Design a protein around this ligand. Structure first.
Ligand SMILES: COc1nc(N(C)C)ccc1-c1cc2c(C(=O)O[C@@H]3O[C@H](C(=O)O)[C@@H](O)[C@H](O)[C@H]3O)c[nH]c2cc1Cl
Ligand SMILES: Nc1ncnc2c1ncn2[C@@H]1O[C@H](COP(=O)(O)OP(=O)(O)O)[C@@H](O)[C@H]1O
Ligand SMILES: Nc1ncnc2c1ncn2[C@@H]1O[C@H](COP(=O)(O)O)[C@@H](O)[C@H]1O
Ligand SMILES: Nc1ncnc2c1ncn2[C@@H]1O[C@H](COP(=O)(O)O)[C@@H](O)[C@H]1O
Ligand SMILES: [Cl-]
Ligand SMILES: [Cl-]
Ligand SMILES: [Cl-]
Ligand SMILES: [Cl-]
Lengths: 366, 283, 161
């Protein structure tokens, strides 16, 4: 009377992931242990994440990094979807930091290099694992880091930003807690910086029971540096925990940092213009001005957000459809700018895009 | 046949740099603004887009400037009225009257040998790399770049004896020769550079098609009466026939020049060996 | 042939699964909490089943049923080929103020010796976005960075108006 999927006998629940329970699986014959994420088909469609799971499975299937949990196979049934992945005995890195204290400089450095190697592999593969925390970093029998919950991860697409505020407030970046738009990698660097602090101190750099003061502390970027902390790592933490994403460290900046470089194993790494047009009018006036000009050019469109437009044009020569995306952003407390983005599908696609923009610019403000 | 096979394998895409800049002019653009744009953007050639035709019709180079200048110059006392007020299409209609020429281009997926042969076949120095799926121009393939990659593979894996290039009926200028006259020679002979000779046959300097953009840059094009030397005051590699072809190819890329002048024992001109000839022999 | 999950969501001391697929033999279901389950291989076709929850016979009301000529009410299952393959199953399953300008878009590669033809590698985020120069002397200069395979090209068009 044992529950079986594949040839693994399903056992104890390891935890409850982003979209389902994760149970241990022990092979009938070999005794090999796996972790099985159970996704109920009817539940994943309820909280419309069918696309999220489709992508998540697609990515994790082609990944292969020694510090990211391997997805061995996906077993599908009429009722549920079973994600069979590699099992690690050591459990949460968080629990390790709870039971034992803070890790020593050498220990912390080792684990941080491993975690960052994985965070890098993800980014290199245009995948940004939002929700990066010690609770999601698992340890194996030999104390090796293993990134695990890709439920809140997302794709990095050429020319687009992400909005979704994902992780735990303590690990979330200021722009994430501020619900502002982000590129992706910077928010993982911030989270990794908090993971590094957790490793060296055994506590959180930004933590308060009073949620508003916690959010202020994060956006102010001010955190305590204990006396035992080596100035060189304080330097790295300062560079990683920058409230300005443009002033914040990149994997390359970290890779180049003298504290990170130390004892770093070989195997870990493989080595007068203006944007659009700015108009000081009211946001909806700008939207009325653009729509009346788009139709004036006889271009087709679809209104996504009240400030997002997906415009199409029929070429009178090549008889080809050329499409672009228009988005209005707020610059100052006084000005707003309209952004033009070409959407990928004869003559030149790129030049056809410029002519499309130029026409609309001629009938518009600054 | 050793290097010849190597070119037939490698795709054009392999030579496109990681991050490039491409300048494109709409045919309706005023031609003076177009040359000044080449100068300001630091680009030697720029493809042309016909808005009505919705396709790349041709390319604007320094030869176009040499052609306008010589064809329409009157004196330093009068403006080159046409150059001042002429569109790229208006001039391309005059330049290519009955004698019409279409656009020569290569796909990034096409081989290096396909591109080298296309340079000599159409008698051209600048070749646009256009992706057929997108229709977008990506990079402009030059002899200097192709011979740079082939020099890296030559290292890892005589001039009179082999006899490579043109050595007879050489087009040259004197120290005192006016710019207008030199521009005329560049037109009738269809050559990239004119070697500057002294009182005797000895070579002192070299005025090239490139040195003509300085007239556009410094806005000194209205006076073509000035001597070739006077024009070259805004800023000479010579080879002998007792030197090996591999050492001749090595000396060229070491200074990154478009051609080498064949000089005798008494510094006098005997012939010329250009990047067009080296790549012709290795095909 | 294809694995099928049989889950009873309720309480119980003992729950069994009877079906056409096992000659209506009482198969016991393992309990986690308020769920009783059994995963078993089924031949892709029609199968009828019932539950023996603590001395009482029942069907799962949320699952499809079939009332018989004799008045028997059993649950029914139609095992599909699309149910067994991941992406086939996921394909069938799928059936205010303006945002603040991200600082990333202000980081141009055109403004930031060397070669004028060459430019720095751009952040994916600023690709396909239109940048422009101020219309000086009635001529518009438009520029954008796009990527062809593993390489990037910043095309700038000089267009009059
Ligand atoms: C008894 O079930 C199991 N026992 C096993 N062992 C080791 C005895 C092994 C696997 C399962 C199993 C569980 C589930 C499942 C599940 O537990 O879903 C939960 O149901 C709860 C509920 O309805 O009360 C909600 O609260 C909650 O969110 C939601 O995850 C969904 N689909 C499944 C498919 C299988 Cl094979
Ligand atoms: N792809 C092309 N198709 C047609 N004509 C071209 C093309 N590229 C250049 N031309 C023409 O070739 C002629 C010579 O140019 P070129 O050899 O490129 O000069 P440069 O020595 O400055 O590089 C010019 O009249 C120019 O318009
Ligand atoms: N000064 C020159 N006189 C005669 N032929 C030349 C001269 N310069 C170049 N050539 C020839 O013109 C062809 C194209 O060379 P180039 O335009 O210099 O890249 C080659 O066959 C050269 O040998
Ligand atoms: N044979 C040569 N020896 C030395 N400099 C040369 C030679 N040919 C051309 N140049 C220089 O190359 C520049 C012209 O560029 P290009 O036509 O691209 O080779 C000028 O600065 C010339 O002085
Ligand atoms: Cl959990
Ligand atoms: Cl066990
Ligand atoms: Cl283990
Ligand atoms: Cl902690």
């Amino acid at each position: 009377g044992r529950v079986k999927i594949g040839h693994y006998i399903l056992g104890d629940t390891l935890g409850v992931g982003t979209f389902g329970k994760v149970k241990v699986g022990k092979h009938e014959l070999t005794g090999h242990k796996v972790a099985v994420k159970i996704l109920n088909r009817q539940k994943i469609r309820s909280l419309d994440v069918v696309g999220k799971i489709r992508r998540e499975i697609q990515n994790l299937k082609l990944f292969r990094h020694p510090h990211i949990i391997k997805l061995y196979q996906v077993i599908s049934t009429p009722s549920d979807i079973f994600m069979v992945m590699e099992y690690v005995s050591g459990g949460e890195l968080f629990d390790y930091i709870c039971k034992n204290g803070r890790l020593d400089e050498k220990e912390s450095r080792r684990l941080f290099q491993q975690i960052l190697s994985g965070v890098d592999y993800c980014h290199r593969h245009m995948v940004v694992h939002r929700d990066l925390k010690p609770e999601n970093v698992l340890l194996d029998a030999h104390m090796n880091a293993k990134i695990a919950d890709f439920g809140l991860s997302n794709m990095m697409s050429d020319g687009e930003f992400l909005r979704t505020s994902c992780g735990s407030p303590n690990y979330a970046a200021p722009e994430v807690i501020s619900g502002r738009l982000y590129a992706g990698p910077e928010v993982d660097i911030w989270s990794s910086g908090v993971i590094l602090y957790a490793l060296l101190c055994g506590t959180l750099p930004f933590d308060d029971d009073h949620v508003p003061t916690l959010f202020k502390k994060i956006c102010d970027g001010i955190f305590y540096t204990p006396q035992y902390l080596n100035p060189s790592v304080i330097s790295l933490l300062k560079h990683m925990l920058q409230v300005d994403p443009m002033k914040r460290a990149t994997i390359k900046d970290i890779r180049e940092h003298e504290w990170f470089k130390q004892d770093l194993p070989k195997y870990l790494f493989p080595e007068k213009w203006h944007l659009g047009i700015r108009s000081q009018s009211r946001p909806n006036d700008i939207m009325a001005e653009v729509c009346r000009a788009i139709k004036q050019l006889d271009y087709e469109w679809k209104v996504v957000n009240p400030y997002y437009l997906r415009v199409r044009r029929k070429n009178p020569v090549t008889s080809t459809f050329s499409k672009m995306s228009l988005q209005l952003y707020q610059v100052d407390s006084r000005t707003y700018l309209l952004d033009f983005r070409s959407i990928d599908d004869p003559g030149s696609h790129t030049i056809e895009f410029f002519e499309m923009c130029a026409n609309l610019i001629k009938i518009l403000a600054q | 046949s050793v290097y010849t096979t190597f070119m037939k394998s490698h795709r054009c895409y392999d030579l496109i740099p990681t991050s490039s800049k491409l300048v494109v002019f709409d045919t309706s653009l005023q031609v003076k603004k177009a040359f000044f744009a080449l100068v300001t953007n630091g680009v030697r050639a720029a493809p042309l887009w016909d808005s009505k035709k919705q396709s790349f019709v041709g390319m604007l180079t320094i030869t176009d400037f040499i052609n306008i200048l010589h064809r329409y110059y009157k004196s330093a006392l009068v403006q080159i009225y046409e150059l001042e007020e002429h569109k790229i299409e208006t001039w391309r209609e005059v330049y290519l009257q009955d004698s019409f020429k279409p656009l020569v281009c290569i796909s990034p997926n096409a081989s290096l040998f396909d591109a080298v042969s296309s340079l000599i076949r159409n008698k051209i120095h600048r070749l646009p790399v256009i992706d057929p799926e997108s229709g977008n121009t990506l990079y402009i393939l030059t002899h200097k770049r192709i011979l740079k990659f082939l020099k890296l593979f030559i290292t890892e894996f005589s001039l009179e004896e082999l006899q490579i290039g043109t050595y007879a009926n050489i087009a040259m200028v004197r120290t005192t020769t006016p710019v207008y006259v030199a521009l005329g020679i560049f037109v009738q002979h269809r050559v990239s550079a004119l070697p500057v000779v002294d009182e005797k046959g000895r070579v002192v300097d070299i005025y090239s098609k490139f040195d003509v953009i300085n007239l556009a840059a410094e806005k000194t094009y209205n006076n073509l009466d000035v001597s070739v030397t006077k024009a070259l005051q805004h800023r000479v590699l010579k080879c002998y026939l007792h030197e090996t072809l591999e050492a001749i190819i090595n000396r060229l890329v070491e200074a990154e020049v478009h051609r080498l002048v064949v000089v005798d024992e008494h510094d006098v001109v005997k012939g010329i060996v250009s990047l067009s000839d080296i790549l012709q022999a290795l095909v | 042939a294809r694995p099928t999950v049989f889950r009873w969501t309720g309480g119980g001391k003992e729950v069994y699964l009877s079906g056409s697929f096992n000659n209506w033999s009482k198969l016991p279901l393992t309990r986690s909490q308020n769920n009783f389950v059994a995963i078993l291989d089924l031949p892709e076709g029609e199968h009828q089943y019932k539950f023996f929850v603590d001395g009482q016979w029942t069907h799962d009301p949320s699952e499809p049923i079939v009332t018989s000529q004799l008045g028997t009410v059993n649950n029914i299952i139609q095992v599909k080929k699309t149910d067994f393959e991941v992406f086939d199953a996921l394909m069938v399953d799928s059936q205010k103020a303006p945002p603040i300008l991200p600082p990333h878009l202000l980081q141009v590669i055109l403004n930031k010796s060397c070669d004028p033809a060459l430019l720095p590698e751009p952040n994916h985020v600023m690709l396909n976005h239109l940048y422009a120069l101020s219309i000086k002397d009635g001529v518009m200069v438009l520029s954008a960075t796009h990527r062809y395979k593993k390489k990037y090209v910043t095309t700038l068009l000089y267009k009059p108006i």
